[PDB]
Write an enzyme that holds these catalytic residues in place. Structure first.
Site, short mmCIF file in Angstrom:
data_model
loop_
_atom_site.label_atom_id
_atom_site.label_comp_id
_atom_site.label_asym_id
_atom_site.label_seq_id
_atom_site.Cartn_x
_atom_site.Cartn_y
_atom_site.Cartn_z
N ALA A 1 -7.66 4.20 9.08
CA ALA A 1 -7.60 2.72 8.55
C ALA A 1 -6.48 1.84 8.49
CB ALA A 1 -8.54 2.67 7.54
N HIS B 1 -9.58 15.60 7.90
CA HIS B 1 -9.29 14.26 7.82
C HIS B 1 -8.07 14.04 6.92
CE1 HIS B 1 -13.61 13.64 8.96
NE2 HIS B 1 -13.79 14.33 8.04
C1 LIG Z 1 -4.05 6.50 5.52
C2 LIG Z 1 -5.37 7.21 6.42
C3 LIG Z 1 -6.58 6.59 6.75
C4 LIG Z 1 -7.40 7.26 7.45
N1 LIG Z 1 -8.58 6.75 8.02
C5 LIG Z 1 -9.64 7.23 8.58
C6 LIG Z 1 -10.58 6.63 9.43
O1 LIG Z 1 -10.78 5.32 9.16
N2 LIG Z 1 -11.54 7.31 9.90
C7 LIG Z 1 -11.29 8.65 10.22
O2 LIG Z 1 -12.31 9.31 10.84
N3 LIG Z 1 -10.24 9.38 9.80
C8 LIG Z 1 -9.34 8.66 9.08
N4 LIG Z 1 -8.16 9.20 8.68
C9 LIG Z 1 -8.16 10.68 9.02
C10 LIG Z 1 -7.38 10.91 10.40
O3 LIG Z 1 -8.11 10.31 11.43
C11 LIG Z 1 -6.86 12.19 10.77
O4 LIG Z 1 -7.86 13.09 10.51
C12 LIG Z 1 -5.65 12.67 9.55
O5 LIG Z 1 -4.44 11.75 9.59
C13 LIG Z 1 -5.04 13.91 10.28
O6 LIG Z 1 -4.14 14.42 9.07
P1 LIG Z 1 -2.58 14.24 9.26
O7 LIG Z 1 -2.37 12.97 9.55
O8 LIG Z 1 -2.08 14.75 7.88
O9 LIG Z 1 -1.90 15.30 10.19
C14 LIG Z 1 -7.25 8.70 7.89
C15 LIG Z 1 -6.16 9.17 7.65
C16 LIG Z 1 -5.13 8.63 6.48
C17 LIG Z 1 -3.93 9.16 6.91
#
Ligand SMILES: Cc1cc2nc3c(=O)[nH]c(=O)nc-3n(C[C@H](O)[C@H](O)[C@H](O)COP(=O)(O)O)c2cc1C
Ligand SMILES: Cc1cc2nc3c(=O)[nH]c(=O)nc-3n(C[C@H](O)[C@H](O)[C@H](O)COP(=O)(O)O)c2cc1C
Ligand SMILES: Cc1cc2nc3c(=O)[nH]c(=O)nc-3n(C[C@H](O)[C@H](O)[C@H](O)COP(=O)(O)O)c2cc1C
Lengths: 352, 326, 352
Positions: C89, C243
């Protein structure tokens, strides 16, 4: 004499760990150390905390459409969430409203208050806080049988619906009295800690269970064979605890001992678990591991220090809210669902 | 025409294994094979039996002065010993008095009768044998929702105090959805029977089951599956006291009843041995088998230091990694 | 209002860990904490990272003469390396070019862009960055069926070639809107987080799979039984994730859960793995453990903060280059070879 905090206010509890350092700022150093400290160099207190990382929660899909419900029942008391207040001496070290303040928070929240034999408040003071709320009475085993009769009579007269018989009396590297025991110790030499047996036996458990007229929990159990012996001796509950690491040093974290005990108890009597519960995840893990409820200790006392009854209430509210979130994430609609959770075994321990 | 045994007499039951061969002398061949047989080459039926040697009992010192008492309670009903009668079809293959005979033995003994969906006696006939004794009704999931509503109404009117929904037949396999439909409309606690996997136990309870009945139907369904007793602890740990557990499939000795209780069952259900007793002596023969299990369990309690059924639930078992041949 | 970085430039990515602290210097503290933070005290975020040390790579002799090729295909899309962009997001918290900037980096690099339902950019803005590149649409399960119809229509109209159904909605010790959901929430009370179910069920998965007209990945799976249930309910992919540790606390590191899931999926549907991928070695380990591709998250966002689309591109380029080196050292000529790697089990964990 002793300058305990007296302010009453709600607090925004983000986590319970920070409550310790926050309380250290308002509680006199001596009283604070009494509450916060543990045996030896605190390695077993740290073990109580780190043990939670040994079994990890899985997020799981939901199987029900309803909103989560944290309510449960124990000994036929319906309670708002699967946690009760642990018996803790001398709440006046934390706050001027002492045990009356804690009892108010507990009763208003809708769970069970455990009253320490070593309460600094009179029962009349506690009763005012309780305002009809359920209460259990914690006792030590007196060397003198008359003193056991006395406290058992006191408990019944005070409307207790269970007795908590603590297995260990009294270890590391007091401004007020104890009116509840002084009521019957006055004029005896004992009233002038040493009045209790240092450790209880199955025969002791049998004596208390036979004469209490109330279900008796045996508190301080860490080994499954003790659980079996206690039940055979007439215990109506097993309270798994190492008393927040305040007794035996270089022992296991309390949570690590729970499954073996639960497996031996095998539903015979309810299990209360404590020693190290700090988060909603801990409540869930204990339930998944065989406890019926957990007891909360230090975090509620730190909340009391910071805000009297409203501060203590805030901590109970934190646990209920956090548990609800854990239920959502684990796909759990109710407390029974929590009892059915699969946990991930983490052989790596804390450092992962 | 089928010439089932008809004599009614008590029998001296020394062990239940010998009842099979003895029954084979009095029951017509076709009917006897139906009762005794199991899937494939019977390897899983043998597994049900050998599984008991995987966890061994310890003799232990006593901690109570009283003589052993086998009584227990399930769903508020007090019973003489921690075992009930399993739902078994077509008792007329074993004896002319059929399910009425079994019902008489069960009520005279003092435990719970399970009535199969495929009973060859009428309810009036079974009711006469029960003489007011407790009964649970076993059903299969009908494809027609109205047939399910009707059987559940009938069961309740017939004084049933639980429903046993058998997972494998009607629908040949049930789903969580099916369990939910039955639990929502029964007005009685529903046991889901045939559970062998802990995730199924969890799903069933979440779907509204009021009991889990661990069973592989005496090895008569899936072949090359584990012995039922080996599946019990994993299920018990997942159920974690949420609902009562009935265990069956292979119980032949008092030691087996003790081991099931120590491993998380609240009661066990008896099947083939009771039917073999029925073949040999009608209700008095079936009674003899129930009496055997009660007396044998009493001996096991003495030797394990157990005064009551709760003490049995607390036993430690010896893990035998060598299995049957030791 | 919110002073996001706006500079566009390539960056020399030596490692992705340093990008976090570097980004902290240019991103407003509030937005930075939102991106970088995780539940509780971040122990499970640390677990996601430390889990990589549980299974170690062996250097191995080569068996082919050709230069390494990082390309692979998923759902028939040929992509330049076995990683895609995770749905995240509010990219505007990192950079003024927001999701359009990320989409440009992803499309220019030659992989798949995942679009969060909670994007701060309009689809038209994202589309300009994508410039024809493949994209998947991430959704939450709405309580109101109409809202699910709406978003599924939006996804198809926007040329999505898969749906990512995230199992968990919304935990620790917002300057702009969400035009993509506001497009269909406007004039409803929901448009004025709570509109989505907190946790999905198999029935939910079945509903989305039946009506999407697109393959549906179920994201947030950590337990093999959920993977099986999801596939039986009609999922066309399993997206193993916690996530980035932003949801359930005191859960396992995501990588530790992967083999058990892969073994249960048993090739039925493709697996996307994420949560903690920081190095080329992590991509290789995930592939060797049953993933078809991994998704990248925080490191790409930190790159975006530091250099807009070119900064984000630099991070993708880093992963591709590092993976190539890992392939050379492990004797791997292609992505399939990586799937066949033997890993060393390290029972000692992080401290070794
Ligand atoms: C700032 C932030 C916002 C996120 N928003 C969403 C979201 O809108 N929907 C979703 O399915 N996952 C969301 N995620 C989870 C990511 O899809 C993903 O699973 C996660 O970033 C992976 O972990 P890592 O970035 O530490 O490797 C978000 C993660 C973060 C970092
Ligand atoms: C300040 C202090 C006083 C205590 N006094 C008693 C006592 O009177 N009787 C008793 O059975 N346990 C007593 N306990 C132990 C608690 O009942 C409980 O087991 C412990 O607080 C749980 O550990 P935790 O608070 O770290 O989670 C005390 C604990 C502390 C913190
Ligand atoms: C002859 C025969 C018929 C059976 N019929 C039924 C049936 O009608 N419904 C049912 O749920 N189980 C039925 N079962 C399974 C029993 O309820 C029970 O699970 C089984 O007899 C236990 O195994 P055991 O008798 O070897 O100890 C039947 C079993 C046999 C022996």
């Amino acid at each position: 004499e002793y300058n305990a905090p007296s302010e009453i206010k709600y607090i925004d509890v983000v986590n319970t760990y920070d409550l310790e350092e926050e309380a250290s700022k308002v509680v006199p150093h001596g009283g604070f150390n009494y509450i916060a400290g543990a045996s030896g160099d605190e390695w077993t207190k740290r073990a109580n905390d780190r043990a939670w990382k040994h079994k990890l929660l899985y997020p799981r899909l939901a199987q029900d459409v309803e909103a989560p419900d944290t309510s449960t029942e124990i000994l036929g008391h319906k309670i708002k969430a699967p946690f009760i207040m642990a018996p803790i001496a001398a709440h006046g070290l934390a706050h001027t409203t002492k045990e009356a303040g804690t009892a108010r928070a507990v009763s208003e929240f809708g769970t069970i208050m455990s009253i320490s034999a070593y309460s600094g408040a009179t029962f009349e003071e506690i009763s005012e806080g309780l305002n009809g709320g359920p209460r259990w009475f914690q006792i030590y085993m007196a060397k003198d049988d008359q003193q056991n009769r006395d406290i058992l009579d006191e408990a019944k007269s005070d409307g207790a619906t269970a007795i908590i018989l603590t297995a260990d009396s009294t270890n590391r590297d007091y401004p007020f009295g104890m009116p509840i025991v002084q009521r019957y110790l006055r004029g005896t030499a004992e009233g002038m800690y040493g009045a209790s047996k240092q450790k209880i036996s199955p025969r002791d458990i049998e004596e208390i269970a036979g004469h209490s007229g109330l279900p008796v929990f045996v508190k301080g159990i860490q080994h499954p064979e003790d659980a079996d012996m206690a039940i055979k001796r007439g215990a109506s509950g097993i309270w798994v605890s190492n008393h927040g690491a305040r007794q035996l040093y270089e022992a296991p974290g309390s949570f690590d001992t729970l499954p073996a005990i639960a497996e031996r108890v095998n539903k015979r009597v309810p299990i209360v678990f404590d020693s190290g519960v700090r988060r909603g995840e801990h409540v869930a893990k204990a339930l998944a591991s065989g406890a019926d409820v957990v007891a909360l200790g230090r975090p509620v006392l730190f909340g009391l220090a910071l805000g009297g009854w409203q501060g203590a209430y805030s901590v109970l509210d934190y646990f209920q809210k956090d548990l609800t979130r854990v239920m959502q994430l684990t796909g759990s609609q109710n407390v029974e669902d929590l009892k059915g959770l699969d946990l991930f075994d983490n052989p790596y321990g804390y450092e992962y």
